[PDB]
Design an enzyme around this catalytic site. Structure first.
Site, PDB file in Angstrom:
ATOM      1  N   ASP A 129       0.818  -1.212   0.000  1.00 20.73           N
ATOM      2  CA  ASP A 129       0.000   0.000   0.000  1.00 20.73           C
ATOM      3  C   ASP A 129       0.860   1.274   0.000  1.00 20.73           C
ATOM      4  O   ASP A 129       1.974   1.327   0.538  1.00 20.73           O
ATOM      5  CB  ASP A 129      -0.930  -0.021   1.231  1.00 20.73           C
ATOM      6  CG  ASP A 129      -0.182   0.115   2.531  1.00 20.73           C
ATOM      7  OD1 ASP A 129       0.659  -0.756   2.826  1.00 20.73           O
ATOM      8  OD2 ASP A 129      -0.421   1.099   3.235  1.00 20.73           O
ATOM      9  N   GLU A 130       0.364   2.313  -0.681  1.00 22.31           N
ATOM     10  CA  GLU A 130       0.891   3.676  -0.601  1.00 22.31           C
ATOM     11  C   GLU A 130       2.311   3.828  -1.151  1.00 22.31           C
ATOM     12  O   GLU A 130       3.026   4.706  -0.649  1.00 22.31           O
ATOM     13  CB  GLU A 130       0.793   4.217   0.836  1.00 22.31           C
ATOM     14  CG  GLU A 130      -0.664   4.395   1.288  1.00 22.31           C
ATOM     15  CD  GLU A 130      -0.931   4.969   2.673  1.00 22.31           C
ATOM     16  OE1 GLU A 130      -0.070   4.850   3.569  1.00 22.31           O
ATOM     17  OE2 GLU A 130      -2.028   5.562   2.856  1.00 22.31           O
ATOM     18  N   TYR A 180     -12.436   0.622   9.621  1.00 22.13           N
ATOM     19  CA  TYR A 180     -11.239   0.939  10.390  1.00 22.13           C
ATOM     20  C   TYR A 180     -11.537   1.545  11.760  1.00 22.13           C
ATOM     21  O   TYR A 180     -12.482   2.293  11.915  1.00 22.13           O
ATOM     22  CB  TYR A 180     -10.372   1.930   9.618  1.00 22.13           C
ATOM     23  CG  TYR A 180      -9.547   1.385   8.468  1.00 22.13           C
ATOM     24  CD1 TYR A 180      -9.737   0.111   7.956  1.00 22.13           C
ATOM     25  CD2 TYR A 180      -8.545   2.164   7.883  1.00 22.13           C
ATOM     26  CE1 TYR A 180      -8.949  -0.394   6.926  1.00 22.13           C
ATOM     27  CE2 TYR A 180      -7.783   1.699   6.819  1.00 22.13           C
ATOM     28  CZ  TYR A 180      -7.960   0.394   6.364  1.00 22.13           C
ATOM     29  OH  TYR A 180      -7.165  -0.007   5.334  1.00 22.13           O
TER      30      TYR A 180
HETATM   31  C1  LIG Z   1      -3.865  -0.036   3.877  1.00 26.25           C
HETATM   32  C2  LIG Z   1      -3.949   1.244   4.651  1.00 26.25           C
HETATM   33  O1  LIG Z   1      -4.863   1.492   5.431  1.00 26.25           O
HETATM   34  N1  LIG Z   1      -2.963   2.119   4.478  1.00 26.25           N
HETATM   35  C3  LIG Z   1      -2.873   3.270   5.362  1.00 26.25           C
HETATM   36  C4  LIG Z   1      -2.500   2.740   6.747  1.00 26.25           C
HETATM   37  O2  LIG Z   1      -1.087   2.710   6.698  1.00 26.25           O
HETATM   38  C5  LIG Z   1      -0.464   1.769   7.723  1.00 26.25           C
HETATM   39  O3  LIG Z   1       0.005   2.595   8.781  1.00 26.25           O
HETATM   40  C6  LIG Z   1       0.602   1.799   9.818  1.00 26.25           C
HETATM   41  C7  LIG Z   1       0.869   2.727  10.974  1.00 26.25           C
HETATM   42  O4  LIG Z   1      -0.340   3.158  11.613  1.00 26.25           O
HETATM   43  C8  LIG Z   1       1.844   1.097   9.248  1.00 26.25           C
HETATM   44  O5  LIG Z   1       2.836   2.038   8.874  1.00 26.25           O
HETATM   45  C9  LIG Z   1       1.429   0.242   8.040  1.00 26.25           C
HETATM   46  O6  LIG Z   1       2.570  -0.390   7.469  1.00 26.25           O
HETATM   47  C10 LIG Z   1       0.701   1.060   7.044  1.00 26.25           C
HETATM   48  O7  LIG Z   1       0.211   0.319   5.913  1.00 26.25           O
HETATM   49  C11 LIG Z   1      -3.059   3.515   7.936  1.00 26.25           C
HETATM   50  O8  LIG Z   1      -2.456   4.803   8.052  1.00 26.25           O
HETATM   51  C12 LIG Z   1      -4.555   3.651   7.725  1.00 26.25           C
HETATM   52  C13 LIG Z   1      -5.307   4.257   8.894  1.00 26.25           C
HETATM   53  O9  LIG Z   1      -5.404   5.719   8.841  1.00 26.25           O
HETATM   54  O10 LIG Z   1      -4.776   4.482   6.575  1.00 26.25           O
HETATM   55  C14 LIG Z   1      -4.175   4.085   5.353  1.00 26.25           C
HETATM   56  O11 LIG Z   1      -3.869   5.236   4.619  1.00 26.25           O
END
Ligand SMILES: CC(=O)N[C@@H]1[C@@H](O[C@@H]2O[C@H](CO)[C@H](O)[C@H](O)[C@H]2O)[C@@H](O)[C@@H](CO)O[C@H]1O
Length: 602
Positions: free
Chosen positions: A267-268, A369
């Site tokens: 992701d991201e 979430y």
């Molecule tokens: C799939 C997803 O929800 N991605 C974002 C989330 O990102 C996660 O963040 C956690 C830390 O809280 C960690 O770094 C992990 O590896 C990430 O994928 C998370 O931020 C979520 C809730 O706001 O939003 C998404 O943008």
């Protein structure tokens, strides 16, 4: 009229009369021999009022609860379904240990109110095969006790899948082994628990983005832009060493998690607007896959390489959906990679499109979430609006698809100090029941959310949920001693183990299962505010503890009293590290060890 149970039964054929639980009732296993089912049944027997014996030798009788494990029923009932009869006896017929166990979850609820249940029958098979909770135990550490309680509750609601993003304390790469992490024995404990409660674990290390928890001390693996600037969270997927590194960490984690699935996150990572800034990813993509290949093709190829890697060991891969945004012009995502859809927008590929491609698609909407300090799933709105897994972010399907796997709620620590894990446990209660209801697939229990919440509260947690004593000390004033020393205020808002100190502390239980620890001398509260922060939380092993003005909202002033016979240890609610004497100077610091303290009323 169908029974008030959660999740609701898939169907109900009502009859006349009632089953009553009496002192003569036995638990009869009259199918195949199965040690796991028998162990489960012995716990179930005790979870009922009265003294029900478990037996496998005798024929069932009126008044008994009959647990009939028939492997020949696997075709009809699957790995998790069961057939329930509420008659002059109760009968649960299933093909597997899991199917029997879920049947017993319904039976505990049927008999909860007054040991009576209206007669009828149901073939109760889940509508969706994946019914999940996800916990991001990332940066912060989430206690194994907390996980054990979650797993019991999940099991009690027939939820069958726990995603855990977490760092295994690494021997392969010790430069990644900074808190938070789980030791390998802790992971093995988690695996043990999940097996006992009929839950599949889905572990994640995120790649190729969100790798700052691993790459902090490997700048050589970090992705650089056209100006040479490193993105610390991002692996340089153009480099063979990057896949070798990641697959090594996956291998180490899979060894201990021993799971069927691996989730790599993904992701991201990048969007197409960034492509002028990553000409090296562009060149690598086009060298491998031709003139039309993009950094997103390289991204997808990296994922497919991990897929091949883990498949070599009989495993299956999963990813988040958001990097599937129609820019992989040449490299399709391998079709046997499960895609967990959490977000829509722009050119992000639509659920209908993913499903039409024949891949497993899970609904993991952002709307499901819970985020520390952020968004909380609005169970009441989702219930009132008849949410089911057909309703994805950005798209509501008009009919089912076989390859829609189910759904999960997800717990994120984005503002890690804004909320304790016990507050989160509170907030997840109704979310958990809602996702279990929506994925099991029976009809809505009541037309009002109020009635659903009433039914959920009435049923309560799983039996055996509570695994700690959160209030082992009466609120009061205590000396906290070890040997010749006591916990005491010291210079510059410090706290130390001081020889011969008569210092004392007011300990008061909080609403969320902790204690505030207030100096009688100074009037200030024991806190963790020093050292390196991640996500706003004080997560540095060795950081000094200190005193600060007492605050109703500072979650770092909340302490868990971890007990033994003659002594206790103090765990910070947020950091999950324990108060430890630093040998050099006697300062109280937070570590993965603990200094044992005796509480002496003063
Ligand atoms: C799939 C997803 O929800 N991605 C974002 C989330 O990102 C996660 O963040 C956690 C830390 O809280 C960690 O770094 C992990 O590896 C990430 O994928 C998370 O931020 C979520 C809730 O706001 O939003 C998404 O943008």
């Amino acid at each position: 009229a169908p029974p008030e149970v959660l999740p609701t039964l898939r169907e109900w054929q009502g009859g006349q009369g009632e089953f009553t639980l009496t002192d003569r009732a036995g638990i009869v296993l009259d199918g195949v021999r199965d040690s796991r089912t028998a162990a489960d049944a012995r716990r179930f027997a005790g979870e009922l009022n009265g003294k029900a014996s478990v037996s496998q030798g005798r024929a069932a009788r009126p008044g008994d609860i009959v647990l009939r494990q028939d492997p020949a029923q696997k075709g009809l009932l699957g790995a998790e379904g069961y057939r329930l009869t509420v008659g002059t006896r109760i009968t649960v017929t299933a093909a597997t240990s899991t199917g029997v166990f879920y049947g017993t979850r319904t039976v505990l609820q049927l008999l909860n109110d007054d040991g009576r249940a209206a007669r009828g029958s149901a073939t109760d098979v889940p509508a969706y095969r994946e019914r999940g909770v996800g916990v991001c135990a990332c940066y912060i550490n989430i206690s194994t006790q907390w996980f054990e309680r979650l797993m019991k509750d999940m099991a009690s609601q027939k939820l069958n899948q726990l995603w855990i993003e977490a760092k295994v304390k690494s021997d392969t790469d010790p430069a990644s082994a900074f808190w938070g992490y789980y030791t390998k024995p802790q992971v093995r404990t988690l695996v043990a628990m999940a097996r006992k409660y009929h839950i599949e674990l889905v572990p994640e290390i995120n790649s190729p983005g969100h790798m700052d928890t691993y790459l902090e001390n490997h700048p050589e693996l970090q992705l650089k832009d056209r100006d040479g600037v490193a993105s610390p969270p991002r692996l340089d997927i153009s480099r063979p060493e990057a896949l070798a590194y990641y697959t090594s960490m996956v291998d180490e984690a899979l060894k201990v998690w021993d799971s069927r699935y691996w989730h790599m996150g993904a992701d991201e990572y990048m969007i197409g607007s960034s492509y002028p800034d990553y000409p090296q990813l562009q060149a690598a993509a086009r060298a491998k896959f031709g003139a039309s290949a993009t950094p997103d093709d390289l991204f997808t190829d990296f994922i497919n390489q991990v897929n091949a890697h883990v498949k070599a060991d009989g495993r299956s891969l999963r990813i988040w959906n958001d990097g599937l945004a129609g820019k992989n012009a040449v490299v399709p995502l391998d079709r046997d990679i499960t895609v967990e859809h959490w977000l829509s927008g722009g050119s992000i590929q639509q659920p209908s499109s993913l499903l039409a491609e024949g891949r497993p698609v899970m609904n993991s909407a952002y709307s499901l979430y819970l985020v520390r300090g952020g968004f909380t799933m609005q169970t009441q709105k989702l219930y009132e609006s008849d949410w089911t897994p057909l309703r994805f972010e950005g798209q509501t399907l008009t009919q089912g698809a076989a390859n829609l796997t189910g759904a999960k709620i997800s717990l994120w620590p984005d503002s890690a100090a804004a909320e304790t894990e016990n507050e989160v446990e509170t907030k997840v209660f109704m979310p958990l029941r809602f996702v279990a209801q929506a994925t099991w697939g029976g009809p809505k229990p009541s037309p009002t959310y109020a009635g659903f919440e009433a039914l959920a509260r009435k049923i309560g947690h799983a039996p055996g949920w509570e695994n700690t004593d959160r209030t082992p000390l009466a609120d009061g004033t205590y000396r906290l001693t070890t040997g010749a020393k006591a916990l005491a205020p010291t210079a510059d808002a410090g706290v130390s183990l001081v020889k011969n100190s008569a210092a004392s502390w007011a300990l008061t239980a909080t609403a969320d299962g902790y204690y505030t620890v207030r100096s009688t001398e100074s009037g200030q509260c024991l806190d963790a505010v020093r050292g390196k922060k991640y996500l706003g939380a004080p997560l540095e092993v060795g950081a000094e503890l200190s005193l600060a003005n007492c605050s109703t909202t500072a979650r770092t002033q909340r302490w868990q009293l971890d007990t033994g016979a003659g002594a206790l240890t103090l765990r910070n609610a947020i950091s999950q590290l324990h108060l430890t004497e630093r040998a050099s100077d006697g300062a109280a610091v937070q570590t993965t060890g603990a200094t044992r303290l005796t509480a002496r009323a003063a």
